[PDB]
């Protein structure tokens, strides 16, 4: 009887729910905050860095925002190992689309593929789901700048500005009351800093705990910039002057 040890992960509950997916969502909501927003100049992704020690190499070390392609990047909230697996898979998917069609994959299509992986895990087999949620931003010539949010169930939805992780309600309120349809890149970055500070329950953000990146489309090319400590510090000085 090996079945006594089975937990039956891919099984409905009396309320028509999946306990494993709910627990993965709890883990994601315990994870650190990751915000994203869309300006008229690009998609901004920010994240709060969880402190481990000051012996961590903080230079050239982005652990909550990753590049999936030249025109797609993502922010992670949940389990880093699961996120790494899914990110490698997404990179493979984007390169496979380019190989098949001689053109770059649309962001919606990539999101659909990775979410299909997640849904298949929740439905087939007897393995646990992925404890990771994604904020996938990108640009393509069909739908312009795009920002998507994906959860462990395989569900995904498009957003103009959103936040995931711990205390995402405060970030969502800040973004709801501040975000505007037409914003410049600098304005969006300042708003991202403000929402990160509010979620972290602080007034003056510290560049040692902030990851900032933005994906823009200029001069016919998509360019991703992952702000360094000094650039984030200049932004924080601007934010301090503003508020």
């Amino acid at each position: 009887m090996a079945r006594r040890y089975d937990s039956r992960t891919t099984t409905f509950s009396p309320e028509g729910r999946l306990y494993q997916v709910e627990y993965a969502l709890e883990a994601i909501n315990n994870a650190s905050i990751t915000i994203g927003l869309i300006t008229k100049d690009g998609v901004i992704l920010g994240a709060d860095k969880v402190f481990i020690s000051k012996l961590i190499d903080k230079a050239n070390n982005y652990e909550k925002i990753y590049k999936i392609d030249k025109h797609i990047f993502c922010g992670v909230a949940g389990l880093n190992a699961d996120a790494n697996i899914l990110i490698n898979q997404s990179r493979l998917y984007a390169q496979r689309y380019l190989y098949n069609y001689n053109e770059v994959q649309p962001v919606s299509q990539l999101v659909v593929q990775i979410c299909d992986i997640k849904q298949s895990y929740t439905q087939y087999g007897g393995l646990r789901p992925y404890g990771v949620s994604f904020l996938i931003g990108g640009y393509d010539t069909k739908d312009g700048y795009q920002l998507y949010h994906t959860d462990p169930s395989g569900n995904y939805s498009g957003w103009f500005a959103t936040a995931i992780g711990t205390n995402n309600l405060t970030a969502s309120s800040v973004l709801k009351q501040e975000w505007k349809n037409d914003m410049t890149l600098e304005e969006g970055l300042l708003l991202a800093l403000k929402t990160l500070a509010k979620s972290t329950d602080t007034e003056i953000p510290k560049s040692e705990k902030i990851e900032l990146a933005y994906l823009t489309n200029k001069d016919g090319e998509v360019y991703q910039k992952y702000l360094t400590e000094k650039e984030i510090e200049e932004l924080i000085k601007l934010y301090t002057q503003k508020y």
């Binding site: 992960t9 993965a24 709890e26 000051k54 012996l55 961590i56 190499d57 190992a81 646990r128 404890g131």
Partner: protein, 228 residues
């Protein structure tokens, strides 16, 4: 039939990974320090009895030239992962004609470790790995946890009393130390952790410095370093 033995708990945790971490934290201590021109990994290898042959136990190992690995946890898991890492390194070499990059190797091994927290019918690896290396992009010290997450460290310690060892190492670590200073600090940290009196027979050291092949220090060199 194969089903996941590691599953989410109502609070959203993977208690199996937590328990693997408990095993690692109970195991013996290891540390790594990135110097200005090199990286060292040291470990405390005590002798359970006078009959064992110290030269037969291998805690610090060489994955390839300019890449060494040490562990804290279960030696069988370590041996399996070490064989896999060597195979991955030679696979990269066969593909690209040059030696594998430390970041690439760490990512591959971390993914392998992750697979054992999700696939069916298996338990997670009960060890933490410290991988030191040198490549065209500089000197690297990475830690891999039983969950499959990896961390880029300037200096780190895993195993027993790793919190106290980390505090001690941080109080006297700066990024500009040399290889000799790093080795002295490593021996000091191991001596601080160890109860009793240390000796060259209780510790092992590996160094990758100045774009030279990874080296495992001998008992005589460790004794020379311990004289101070």
């Amino acid at each position: 039939y194969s089903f996941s033995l590691t599953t989410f708990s109502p609070t959203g945790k993977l208690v199996q990974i937590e328990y693997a971490l408990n095993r690692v934290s109970s195991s013996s201590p290891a540390l790594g320090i990135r110097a200005k021109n090199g990286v060292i990994i040291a470990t405390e290898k005590k002798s359970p009895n006078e009959l064992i042959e110290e030269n037969s136990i291998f805690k610090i190992q060489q994955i390839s030239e300019h890449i060494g690995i040490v562990y804290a946890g279960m030696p069988g898991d370590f041996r399996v992962l070490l064989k896999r890492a060597r195979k991955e390194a030679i696979r990269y070499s066969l593909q690209y004609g040059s030696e594998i990059l430390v970041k690439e190797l760490v990512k591959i091994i971390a993914s392998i470790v992750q697979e054992f927290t999700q696939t069916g019918g298996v338990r997670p690896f009960g060890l933490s790995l410290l991988i030191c290396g040198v490549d065209v992009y500089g000197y690297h010290l990475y830690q891999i946890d039983p969950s499959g997450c990896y961390f880029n460290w300037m200096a780190t310690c895993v195993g027993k009393d790793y919190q106290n060892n980390m505090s001690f190492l941080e109080k006297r670590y700066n990024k500009d130390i040399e290889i000799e200073d790093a080795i002295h600090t490593a021996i000091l940290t191991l001596k601080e952790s160890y109860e009793g009196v240390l000796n060259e027979k209780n510790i092992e050291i590996g160094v990758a410095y100045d774009n030279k092949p990874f080296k495992i220090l001998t008992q005589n060199e460790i004794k020379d370093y311990l004289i101070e």
